[PDB]
Structure formats: C-alpha cells, structure tokens
Amino acid sequence: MSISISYSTTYSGWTVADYLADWSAYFGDVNHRPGQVVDGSNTGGFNPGPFDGSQYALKSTASDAAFIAGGDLHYTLFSNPSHTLWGKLDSIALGDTLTGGASSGGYALDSQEVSFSNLGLDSPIAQGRDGTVHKVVYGLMSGDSSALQGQIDALLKAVDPSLSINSTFDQLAAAGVAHATPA
C-alpha cells in the first residue's frame, strides 16, 4: 500500500507543507515535557491503554484541534529509554473535536480536516526518542510538524518524483494519492 490522503475540499488549493505548518500553529504546544505533565490535561490517551494502543489521541489545550495516531503504538513511560513512543505508525488524522476513547471502542474526530494513511513507519524501542515514530508524534504534540512533513515528502516522492509535500491536495488527487471528502 502506498500513502493515501483524505482532505476536506476547503484545502484543495493548499500545499501539504503549508497546511501542516498552519495546523501545527493552530494546535500549538501542549507543553508535554518533564515537570509540565502534572495532571491529565496534556497527556492524551491510548486505545485501549494504559500505555499501548492501536490509537493514541490528543486534544489541543489551546483550541478544539486534535489528532489521532493509528497503528501499533507503545509508550515506555519510566522504563528505559524513558518517555519513548515507539511501534508502528500507519496513520495520522488531523481535525477538530476529538470524540470517544478506550471505553467507547475507539477515538474519532467529529470534524476531520486531513488524514494520512499507509505511512508504513516502524520504530524499535531501543532507538528511544531518536525513533521516527516518536519524533513524528511528539512534533504534533509540541507545535512542530517538520518530522511528519519529512516522512510524507519521502512517501510521496516514492510514488512519483513530481509529487512532494509542496504539491497541492488537488494535485495529489489528480495523481491518485489523495481524495477529497464526498461532500
């Protein structure tokens, strides 16, 4: 499976890079770092959890923005290497209004903007916070989507070298990689 993209028609004329830069600034930084995770307000959650899931999801503390990372994900918590998210990352869904969770059988978004699927990312535990999965997801938590942008760029170029993070969603749709919402 090659990378597949779903996008709201709103972003037809946007490039993926610009969309993601704007989304990152919109979601912001939840300030998830040592000494700044003191309650549940900026942890997010796993489905099913407690520290592992086919989904990890997080709401912005600033806005209604949220993301859902899909795959086979693991968090080391306090075990070495500490505070490492690793495993398989298949998908990233970006949007507004996170719903659900482990107790209701999964996370969803009420208003998804864009999703990237078949990412094929797979990072081992021993790589720690240098792992690609860790950096992609932590980027989305911390207001910097450059790691995700980098991985999407590489996957698009592998489909065809005319495709990049700087293609518009409509260009990517013409190329058979992306698809606009039914509407």
38: tokens are 């003191």
Q: CA end-to-end span of the chain, whole Å?
A: 26
Query: Strand, coil or helix: what is 44?
Result: coil
CA-to-CA distance for 91 and 74, rounded, in angstroms? 15
Method: X-ray
Would you state the torsion angle of the CA atoms of residues 148, 121, 178, 22, taken in this order, to the nearest 10 degrees? -10
138: tokens are 């932590």
Could you tell me which residues are annotated as the binding site for heme b?
A: 32, 35, 75, 83, 129, 138
Could you tell me which residues are annotated as the binding site?
A: 32, 35, 75, 83, 129, 138
Going along the chain from its start, the domains and CATH numbers come out as 1-183 (3.30.1500.10)
Could you tell me which residues are annotated as the binding site for heme?
A: 32, 75
CA-to-CA distance for 134 and 130, rounded, in angstroms? 7
Nearest by Cα to 91 from 60, 65, 121: 121
Nearest by Cα to 53 from 115, 102, 97: 102
Nearest by Cα to 169 from 41, 62, 50, 11: 11
HSE-up of residue 143 (Cα within 13 Å, Cβ side): 11
Do residues 179 and 6 lie in contact, with contact meaning Cβ atoms separated by under 8 Å? yes
CA-to-CA distance for 172 and 105, rounded, in angstroms? 32
DSSP H helices, 61-183, are 132-141, 146-159, 169-174
75: tokens are 């968090």
179: tokens are 């698809």
